[PDB]
Amino acid sequence: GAKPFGEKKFIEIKGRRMAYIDEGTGDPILFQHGNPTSSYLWRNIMPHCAGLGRLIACDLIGMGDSDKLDPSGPERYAYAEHRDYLDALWEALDLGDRVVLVVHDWGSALGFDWARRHRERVQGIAYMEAIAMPIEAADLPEQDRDLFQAFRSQAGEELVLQDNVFVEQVLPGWILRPLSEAEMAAYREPFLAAGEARRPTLSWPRQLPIAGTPADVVAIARDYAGWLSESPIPKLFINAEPGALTTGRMRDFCRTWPNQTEITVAGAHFIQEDSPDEIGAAIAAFVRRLRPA
Numbered sequence: 001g002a003k004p005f006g007e008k009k010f011i012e013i014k015g016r017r018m019a020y021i022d023e024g025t026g027d028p029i030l031f032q033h034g035n036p037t038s039s040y041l042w043r044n045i046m047p048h049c050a051g052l053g054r055l056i057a058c059d060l061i062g063m064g065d066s067d068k069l070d071p072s073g074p075e076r077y078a079y080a081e082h083r084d085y086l087d088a089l090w091e092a093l094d095l096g097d098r099v100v101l102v103v104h105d106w107g108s109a110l111g112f113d114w115a116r117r118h119r120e121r122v123q124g125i126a127y128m129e130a131i132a133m134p135i136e137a138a139d140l141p142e143q144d145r146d147l148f149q150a151f152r153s154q155a156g157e158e159l160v161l162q163d164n165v166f167v168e169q170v171l172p173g174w175i176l177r178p179l180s181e182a183e184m185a186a187y188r189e190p191f192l193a194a195g196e197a198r199r200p201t202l203s204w205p206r207q208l209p210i211a212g213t214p215a216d217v218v219a220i221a222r223d224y225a226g227w228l229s230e231s232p233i234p235k236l237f238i239n240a241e242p243g244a245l246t247t248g249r250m251r252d253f254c255r256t257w258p259n260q261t262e263i264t265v266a267g268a269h270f271i272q273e274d275s276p277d278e279i280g281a282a283i284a285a286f287v288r289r290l291r292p293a
């Protein structure tokens with residue numbers, strides 16, 4: 001299905017509208033997307049969890065239906081800034097102390113870090129295709145390595161701001177099946193305008209903690225990595241075959257984490273588009289185990 005889940009609501013955070021879905025009552029279950037998606041990514045997964053809590057999915061600043069930052073440029077949309085907006089949004093949504101996080105891609109970096117800073121508020125973490133630790137160049141898939149190194153160079157502006165490569169190539173290229181015209185449309189929407197409307201999709205791969213740089217994200221991911229491998233918080237690892245980002249060393253490291261159940265589903269990076277029913281079912285079962293009634 002191409003239909004979004006829920007109705008978008010909006011909240012002004014530091015003078016900017018942020019968009020989010022919030023359905024149901026009870027302890028929250030937060031779904032957090034990464035690059036270059038939005039809450040739309042979760043549309044066929046969130047229904048599986050209906051009645052198990054308050055289902056929330058936020059659009060990160062500059063993505064989905066949330067506002068762009070003004071002014072925009074190469075210093076905007078770094079990890080730190082996204083973190084500031086999302087922290088403040090999660091505050092304003094009145095989440096309580098029994099939060100289940102469901103995370104993907106940069107959503108995992110954000111969610112893992114937040115969970116670390118608020119560990120007594122977290123009831124469970126489900127993650128998939130996540131940035132679970134700092135990596136090296138060799139840990140990127142062979143076929144995508146050189147393109148990501150290009151984004152991280154001066155060639156990135158032309159590739160992403162003019163040609164929109166992250167949306168038009170990386171996104172479809174990391175989904176096993178072809179998207180319908182309506183599904184592409186929804187992912188394209190926030191990035192139709194060339195220029196700074198696309199800055200978020202370029203700023204993100206420039207934040208990837210690769211070979212020690214950028215150093216502040218390295219250190220954040222190094223901190224949450226250590227913590228997660230030592231945390232008794234229950235965890236659901238949704239492993240993808242063949243996967244993309246959570247493979248190799250990162251996958252071995254994730255499997256060392258305590259109090260973790262694991263399932264494996266078909267997919268590359270955007271696995272929600274390939275096996276949404278398996279993922280949704282597993283998340284639901286996980287949340288049911290943590291919230292017997």
Ligand SMILES: [Ca+2]
Pocket residue numbers: 070071072
């Ligand atoms: Ca302007």
Ligand SMILES: [Cl-]
Pocket residue numbers: 035204205208
């Ligand atoms: Cl990225």
